[PDB]
């Protein structure tokens with residue numbers, strides 16, 4: 001069995017990547033460049049328990065970032081609702097371009113190794129009006145020399161060596177979700193008893209022009225990974241919680257870069273860009289049940305012809321029949 | 324770029340090997356088990372120039388067994404003839420099953436990692452009619468514990484463990500293999516174990532056989548396939564059936580013939596191969612000689628079952644991003 005996902009079909013990996021820059025449309029009226037179609041794809045991961053412990057192991061060591069998985073689970077941040085389907089973290093290259101690799105993988109099962117997503121970000125930042133972005137960024141910077149700092153954030157987005165690439169931060173995620181026209185939700189390491197995490201909405205587009213399922217990422221130790229839904233059926237539902245447990249209460253995930261009126265109508269705004277559902281969960285006061293908001297997650301839609309996970313699964317079967 | 328060839332498309336490789344066992348026809352009437360269709364496939368290597376030497380070096384390090392290439396070239400056994408196309412040696416695992424690995428690669432661009440060819444060979448020697456084979460082997464051995472000696476040759480072909488993962492194979496194993504494939508095998512080495520030479524599927528009439536050879540290279544107990552380079556005309560697409568030897572041309576050995584077969588060697592060659600008579604430079608520069616050569620097949624492995632075309636698409640993609 002291959003030691004990583006991409007090794008299962010290098011040829012197909014390259015075909016996928018070569019579709020991506022041709023799916024990009026660049027407007028001429030100042031409108032941000034964005035994907036025409038591919039932003040709607042979503043990967044689901046197959047179930048591995050149908051095998052034997054030694055086999056599980058090799059599958060997990062190849063595909064799964066078990067360190068991040070375990071850290072986020074042990075904080076009750078990942079996979080804490082009994083109602084909902086398990087999410088698993090996929091390994092991702094830690095080269096500085098990992099926000100792009102994790103995002104690329106969630107949708108397309110390949111990493112950003114041609115820098116297509118990375119270049120799209122630097123492009124928007126370097127070669128259009130970013131006034132609104134800067135404004136929303138200044139607001140967030142003050143909730144917790146403007147020109148010097150803004151120039152640096154743009155420079156961070158380049159494909160220049162400073163780790164092969166400059167790491168990226170919140171505003172970069174925000175710009176990226178607007179290039180994809182698709183929300184990104186980051187589940188990050190962080191106990192209140194003792195900033196990257198949160199919800200990024202494509203607010204430069206009307207919600208009707210956007211894909212209404214999120215890309216879900218994990219973040220820990222300065223490293224992004226996709227958190228993709230495990231295939232099952234069923235009866236649990238595909239959703240990601242929009243709040244965290246905080247001891248006896250709940251703390252809403254941070255919604256990034258909102259302007260003041262937007263923040264006033266935050267719940268409404270969330271309900272436009274995401275498919276917001278209510279989920280009963282056991283209370284940690286005397287309560288026993290509370291309803292919390294969660295977003296619906298997409299069902300697997302990445303056609304086999306562009307799905308490395310399908311090919312990976314099929315290698316697994318072949319190698320398992322031989323036991 | 325991929326470290327080896329199979330890494331180019333691991334999934335396609337699995338599918339290729341999956342097709343192999345179901346292409347084997349298994350007669351009850353005692354006639355040897357053979358391939359219905361897949362023996363007619365041939366791989367070629369793609370042209371590795373038009374690239375710059377750091378990338379040409381990347382490719383050759385990845386795909387070419389340069390040590391064995393250099394060896395067979397310096398001893399003047401491989402690519403000695405300036406009139407025919409260059410052949411290249413592809414890396415092959417040396418686990419003891421490399422006769423099969425090399426042969427499997429030549430036709431299918433994959434190695435015999437599922438032991439389909441290995442098992443077919445053993446299945447022939449252990450579950451069918453081996454009278455005539457044992458006879459030809461005796462005849463050949465005496466040209467220089469016969470039941471026991473033959474008995475271990477049958478065991479060597481097994482998938483048992485011997486210090487490699489598998490027992491090594493010999494001349495008689497090659498001859499049986501060519502009759503399962505219904506296709507000649509030609510081995511180039513430094514004899515020309517005297518493994519070098521021509522192996523014809525004499526348990527079949529030539530009419531029921533594919534008349535293009537599988538070409539292997541052999542040195543240091545190691546087999547590799549010797550495949551043609553793709554776009555290299557005007558040179559002749561053929562392998563010579565003789566070597567230069569001390570000022571003369573000497574026929575490659577033809578293995579396991581009976582006496583009456585040997586009295587008509589040239590006729591047998593012309594039935595099982597596509598023999599052509601070609602001119603080459605003599606030792607006196609005032610002189611040309613006619614020699615026999617056997618036509619080599621054209622690349623016919625469809626893309627859907629060709630690891631080499633995927634490797635090349637990878638290479639192409641990488642070159643533009645450089």
Ligand SMILES: [Cl-]
Pocket residue numbers: 403404405406603604
């Ligand atoms: Cl010559």
Ligand SMILES: [Cl-]
Pocket residue numbers: 567568569570571
């Ligand atoms: Cl000579």
